[PDB]
Paper text:
Tankyrase 1 and tankyrase 2 (TNKS1/2) are members of the PARP family of enzymes that control protein activities, interactions, and turnover through mono- or poly-ADP-ribosylation. TNKS1/2 regulate a number of target proteins, including AXIN1 and AXIN2 (AXIN1/2) in the β-catenin destruction complex resulting in WNT/β-catenin signaling pathway inhibition, and AMOT proteins in the Hippo signaling pathway resulting in YAP signaling inhibition. Tankyrases, through their ankyrin repeat clusters, bind to AXIN1/2, making AXIN1/2 accessible for ADP-ribosylation by the C-terminal TNKS1/2 catalytic domain. Although the catalytic domains of 17 human ARTD/PARP enzymes are homologous, unique features in the TNKS1/2 catalytic domain allow the development of tankyrase-selective chemical inhibitors. We have previously developed tankyrase inhibitors bearing a 1,2,4-triazole moiety and binding predominantly to the adenosine binding site of the tankyrase catalytic domain.
Lead compound OM-1700 (13) within the novel series displays high potency and specificity and has overall favorable ADME properties compared to benchmark tankyrase inhibitors. As a consequence, in the following optimization campaign, the South 2-chlorophenyl moiety was replaced with the 2-fluorophenyl group of 23 resulting in acceptable efficacy compared to other substitutions. Next, all possible hybrid combinations were synthesized employing the East moieties of compounds 20 and 21, a South 2-fluorophenyl group, and three different West moieties revisiting the 2-pyridyl-4-methylsulfonyl moiety as well.9 From these six molecules, compounds with the 1,5-naphthyridine moiety (10, 11, and 12) showed approximately 30-fold improved cellular inhibitory efficacy compared to their counterparts with the 2-pyridyl moiety (13, 14, and 15, respectively). The binding mode of compound 13 in cocrystal structures was similar, and the hydrogen bonds to the backbone amides seen in the 1 cocrystal structures were retained. A water molecule forms bridging interactions between the pyridine nitrogen and Gly1058 and Tyr1050, and the same applies to all the cocrystal structures described. However, compounds with this naphthyridine moiety were less stable in microsomes relative to the corresponding East-pyridines, and consequently, 13 was short-listed for mouse pharmacokinetics studies. In due course of the study, 13 had been further characterized including selectivity toward other members of the PARP family, structural analysis of its binding mode, kinetic solubility, Caco-2 permeability and efflux, CYP3A4 inhibition, mouse plasma stability, mouse plasma protein binding, hERG inhibition, Ames test, and off-target safety panel, exhibiting overall favorable parameters.
Author numbering: 951 to 1110, 1115 to 1160
Write the structure that this text describes.
């Protein structure tokens, strides 16, 4: 592996930026905490910057290709990712080959602009079994991990699929009175995202 994790001082403005974004994007969900647990705040334990030259060159290369297909604009956004695979991803990069067939927008890798949404997916689809130790989707004890990722969206198709629709690079899923409540984002190519910050945390009891 080429990956090294550099720990950030809570003193650091880089930490405080990611901390602020994570806490501020939390929302009350429709499921009543069923999937991700009940909370309005996290206990931010550790923020590490992920450094891999090969993984970075994979990303910046793809980003250039998208820009030339999208009027010299990458449409780069910083978004959250949640999944069982976080420990794999920080070493090997995103891999679409492990994408899940069932999922509102087909076999892609899902992202959120709301940390609380991405949280729901950490122990699997709709929380799965919950935490390995207590089998509790609302565990306040077991430490969790999200990624705060640099994601190249390109020309994003809006919608309420194996790949992107033609002439598009992503899908922006959108709120729907009989569908989504917040925005999802989906890529169909692992090189269109970089896992930049690894966040270790727990959800807090009100
Ligand atoms: Zn637990």
């Amino acid at each position: 592996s080429g990956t090294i994790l550099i720990d950030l001082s809570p003193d650091d403005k880089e930490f405080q930026s990611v901390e602020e974004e994570m806490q501020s994007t939390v929302r009350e969900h429709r499921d009543g905490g069923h999937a991700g647990g009940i909370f309005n705040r996290y206990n931010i334990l550790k923020i590490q910057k992920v450094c891999n030259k090969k993984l970075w060159e994979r990303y910046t290369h793809r980003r250039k290709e998208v820009s030339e297909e999208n009027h010299n604009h990458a449409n780069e956004r910083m978004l959250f990712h949640g999944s069982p695979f976080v420990n794999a991803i920080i070493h090997k990069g995103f891999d679409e080959r492990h994408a899940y067939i069932g999922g509102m927008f087909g076999a892609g890798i899902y992202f959120a602009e709301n940390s609380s949404k991405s949280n729901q997916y950490v122990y699997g689809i709709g929380g799965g079994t919950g935490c390995p130790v207590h089998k509790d989707r609302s565990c306040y004890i077991c430490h969790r991990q999200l990624l705060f990722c640099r994601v190249t969206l390109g020309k994003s198709f809006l919608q309420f699929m194996a790949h992107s629709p033609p002439g598009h690079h992503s899908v922006t899923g959108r709120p729907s009175v009989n569908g989504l409540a917040l925005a999802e984002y989906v890529i169909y190519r692992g090189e269109q995202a970089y896992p930049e910050y690894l966040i270790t945390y727990q959800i807090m009891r009100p």
